[model samples]
Target: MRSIARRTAVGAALLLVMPVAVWISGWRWQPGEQSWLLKAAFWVTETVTQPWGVITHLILFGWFLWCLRFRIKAAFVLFAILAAAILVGQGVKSWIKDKVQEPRPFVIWLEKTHHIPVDEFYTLKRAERGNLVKEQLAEEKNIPQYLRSHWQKETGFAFPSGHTMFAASWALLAVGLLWPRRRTLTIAILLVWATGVMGSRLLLGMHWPRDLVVATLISWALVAVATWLAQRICGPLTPPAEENREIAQREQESLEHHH
Candidate 1:
């Protein structure tokens, strides 16, 4: 909490700015129910926040051990940093959710999200047969709306976007671990990805504009603290070029030894 607050303190301007943004959204926000933008927006949000979200996160979790199977003891230090970054984001998300008790867009504004009054419509997107219609869209598109998935619901607190928080945390982990080489490129990619995730939540009408900004701020702080510890304990991260060559050499040496 202190780590996150430290960064937010530094970015105090953002604290003021987020609420202001939310204020403007109230005046400027005017999306229609039938807008294709809403359809596409919810589609992406549901897809990105689905079961693969957790499963893919585990894929990276496996990488914690895989990447360091044959490296410095300090690599283990970085591994712990990565793990803490992810776990902390989740913990904070839950903590804030319970504390804030904020409402989601669908709950507050049925019109903004274009919520269909019927049960079968699914996020109020297309069908007109009502709420009880079988989820044919699930098979047709594999959309989360028609499924019984356990992704975040649309009725809980919306103070900070958990999806955006996780995305920002993962971005930091990726860029930090790849530091000292391709740093610029890695950061560029992460920024784009993080922006997309945050923006998608707004488009989906799942979160408020300010919710994402605050989440990014907290995740940004978490990453900063993690990096500071990593650098102090592990020194600089392995340069990508050097790490790649070493892996190739290790593979060749192992093959020849077996022969």
Candidate 2:
């Protein structure tokens, strides 16, 4: 009871102070204020938040290839498992987006700005969709250039951020594999980068807080299931030489039994 009470007290303390921290930071929902510091921060955030931007996939694939040099069978099996996990994660993400069909905060902003109904905005031609928002943004010069481009790029549904889901899933996978290898630095770098990616999705106004919260929860569940499945299907990720010898012994025993 004391431990639980102490933990709960700490949680409450952090929750109480988080808002004050945000208030001190002066972050606003509007087109973020421009300053040299903000520009640098935004640049770094955008660069680090590329997990869903096709780059992370390449990085993961490169890791797979690197492992190929050392552990061929284990690497292949692990790669296959990881790929399936990613595909399933993305498939569920897409389905949820379609089902939820929630308009992004920026989409709502565009609707209010143009006095157009949200549903009607979807009916506009592809070119019109781009040109309409560009024209309005041109007139509204207060919006930062980087943010304007980001808003236009992400006009899709907004529930359960895909970036957050992907980043979290990969982070969990890294933890699962790296913990055994004792690659502490690699795990920390990937995890921190994933954390930043999730935060950037919200800071840029592309997703609501609930979107990230739900996404993080879902990713945890999915990765947990995937880790269990991988264990059942592939055995150890990188079996030691002792296990390899044991496997050979079993094979020899089976051959003699057949004879």
Candidate 3:
């Protein structure tokens, strides 16, 4: 009952309290002035969202599994389950994006700047749309060239950011696996990294604040189900506390004999 209540409270904060705070923070969805902080966020966003980002996530999880001393087969199966969760969540996210068809922040910014209707922007081919945004960014002296390039590549509907969803799912799974071992510091680091990824989307004007919040909530649900299923199939990912204590005692005894 205690764990249940704790989890429920955390869920409520994530879904309700934090999101409301983010929504009211008055951060612009469309970035105008470039700050050093926003520049840093840009690199973080690229590191997580680009094709190379998957390697980073995989390495993080692989290292954690190794630390936990998960058996080779169990680690492999757990990774498979995580991949399946991501795949299913992505499918749902894509479907939601299609149905929502919400214009990205840059799209709206371009429409306002050029007096072009968003519907007309959608009429252009994908490459054309990218070019159109590139041209708009080129005219703005304040926007940097690299950011221009970034905006041009993002010609998709903006709602429930895919990058945020992926990061959140990975973090949730890591926490679920690590919690039994009381790996608080590791869990905190993982959570911070995941939260940073979500914030990066907003800072880059690639996604709305609400987009990230919704993605996180949805990703949490998917991860919960995946974690439960993986545990059922592979047993506990972490060894029991008594086993850890026994190993520690053995190490201590060996150290004393060596002395």
Candidate 4:
């Protein structure tokens, strides 16, 4: 049992690392041309579609409740794992945002075009231009406004995406819990949901392709660790062969006495 636990932990950890390594090694964002497919994808990721994501989570949570019905202690263990994963993901996000402080693509583009003064971090307004030169100048001057309108002003950090982190964490948890029973269906559901959430951030222009990639990797790693820890702590909650035999014996004795 101890060996099994150790192997599970190791396997989960390896599975978590591969995606992250691949994401970091090849990180870039190239927005595809707007097309019917892109529009449909974007529509499916809007706030109105959030209900679908909620329903997906509800199904997973319900399954978790059902599977561990005989073990109250294991249910608590699962809750603890989920809570820890969320806390860890948020803490890492805050830390990375402050440490890296990399600006978003829009901000970078604005700066590169020299729309705003080198020292001016705030937005400035310029006269509207009817020509390309005038339009360019106006676009530069209005970048701060555009940014304020489109992006969250409080946190400009752009390296890692919080939405991606949350999505990946939830998806990983679902996969870990359900893979044993419905591997193909579980994988398909999780992939679709995760992709929708990650793609939403990109469509909204809140994160670069690399940001989602890295965040997904980090979240998966954290969730894998959390799941392993939860399983270890709750392993005893699952009855061993001897315990099951003892339970059967007790039931049989009770039935005989009742007769």
Candidate 5:
């Protein structure tokens, strides 16, 4: 219990501190020259981890339901945690985006103003494509002119991407709840999935790199809080007999082998 609490504290502290440090450092976004590498990485990540997020969540909710069976209380608790996470993640992004309203990297690049600091240069290329889309929209007369008007507007909200936040929140929640015994694997899987989703947003020109970073940090914090609350409300869902027996047997085996 003490170890778990200590680790959680450390993780939370790092998640909160690291993003602030990066943002304050004034890192600017510039697309890397390595087009081949970026494309390869993005493709591999997207292909492999794409289904994991949705599939895992479906399985988790299904399992939770199965575990609860007909118990309304357990069902409510599970649903509450899931709902709270989604709401909190989206709410934080909405609030921050409204407050900051920083221009996307593509807009800044087109205007040639380093208004917003860039965290991921490679991702900026993705945002640049948004400029192309805006140009295409401007050529059409029947299309809503307001969409083009808002395209390069600096007041446009770009920070804290919704896709990144949702992916991170769901993936982290799954890692926290279902794979407690396999912490390393669970974390690795979530990291890959979250990174893929974040990268996809960049490729889609939906967000800047800093946006993904902010979203990831927000998601991590929310997931941690949600998981802690779930544990508290549900009263330690860990499998008792199996976990205890495994621990005891391992200890006994270690002692006998050493002796």
Candidate 6:
């Protein structure tokens, strides 16, 4: 596992820059919105899309601290990486949210369809670029008739997916820390986890394709730097079996000495 992780550590930087390449080339970058997956996405992001989302992060922090029991310094390194991802990512996201003022997809859809505005203050139907907005909304499945209420009265700030940024960064931190032994399994799990989270945000119409890529790329930079520092300061975060072997080897050596 150690060798495998070491081998792949260099490749991890791709997470940081690959998305930017996608953004530039616009490759496979049609938002990846699966209308069929809306119900699940709605549920998955239920906590995350609301005030509870903040609370959920706190719970994750507590759990992260608990995980340190196993790896101590090594876990601390991963914790630091995720912590930075959330802190820096969220901070950047908050300011950008206010600056862009890009309404969630729901806002656009509501204005186009219903007479009601999204803010719950009744109605303020408006938009200059009518056909373009309607066309993109249709292509993106903004009005997934099955779940009309998925909008949940969300406000704008729709550039760069904050949820996706943190999830992708957390994926890197977790897989990096628990590799070689469950290397294949760990990667598989984390990939699904991160991808699912990304999908959820899209399903909720809380972000655009550009937003997801942008946030992820930015986070990749932070994760890459944090990982490098972790490597330098904490050394390789040796996996479970490796530590077990070391412990067993010590026990045997002590037995022989006493005999």
Pick the lDDT winner: 3
Q: For each candidate in turn, give its C-alpha RMSD to the true structure in angstroms.
A: 10.2, 11.1, 4.6, 9.4, 8.7, 8.5
Q: What is the TM-score of candidate 2?
A: 0.61
Q: Which ten residues in a row have the lowest lDDT in candidate 3?
A: 1-10
Q: How would you encode candidate 3's per-residue C-alpha lDDT over 117-185 as one tens digit per residue? A: 867877877656656666777687767777766766665456567677777665665565665555668
Candidate 4 regions off by >4 Å? 1-59, 67-72, 88-98, 112-114, 117-150, 153-156, 236-259
Q: How far does residue 238 in candidate 3 sit from its true spot (Å)?
A: 4.9
| List of clashing residue pairs for candidate 6 | 1-180, 160-211
lDDT of 1 by residue, 1-259 (tens): 3432343343333333544466576732333445566556555455357555776566655664455444456566766876766686577657664354444554334322345453433344322222222332223232344222221343424566667766666566655554323345654565566666666666555667667767777776776666567657876544445677876787798889978
Give a tens-digit lDDT track for model 5, residues 69-153: 4343544675788677667656765666435535565455544443334454335554454444455446645323433343434
1 versus 3: better TM-score goes to = 3
**Which ranges of candidate 3 are over 4 A from the true structure?**
1-18, 70-72, 88-100, 117-142, 246-259
For model 2, residues 1-259, the per-residue Cα lDDT tens digits are: 2321232233223322433355466554544334664455455455435544566667865774563334455556656776786687668666664355455656566667668886787787655665676576657666677776666566535655666666666566556554444456766776676666655664566666556556666666665555456556755454467645765787798889978
Instruction: Please say which candidate is ahead in lDDT: 5 or 6.
Output: 6
lDDT of 6 by residue, 1-259 (tens): 3453443343344443444454576543123356557677766665465556777666655654454344567657766676766676667666663355466655555455654444642232333323334444445444554444343333433566667766676566555554433345655665566667766765565665567666666655666667667767876555466566765787799899988
Q: Model 6 Cα displacement at 22 (Å)?
A: 11
What lDDT score goes with residue 193 in model 5?
A: 65
How many backbone clashes can be found in candidate 1?
4
Lowest summed lDDT across 10 adjacent residues in model 2 is found at 3-12
Sorting all predicted structures by TM-score, with the top scorer first, yields: 3, 2, 6, 4, 1, 5
Candidate with better TM-score, 4 vs 6: 6
TM-score of each prediction: 0.56, 0.61, 0.76, 0.57, 0.55, 0.58
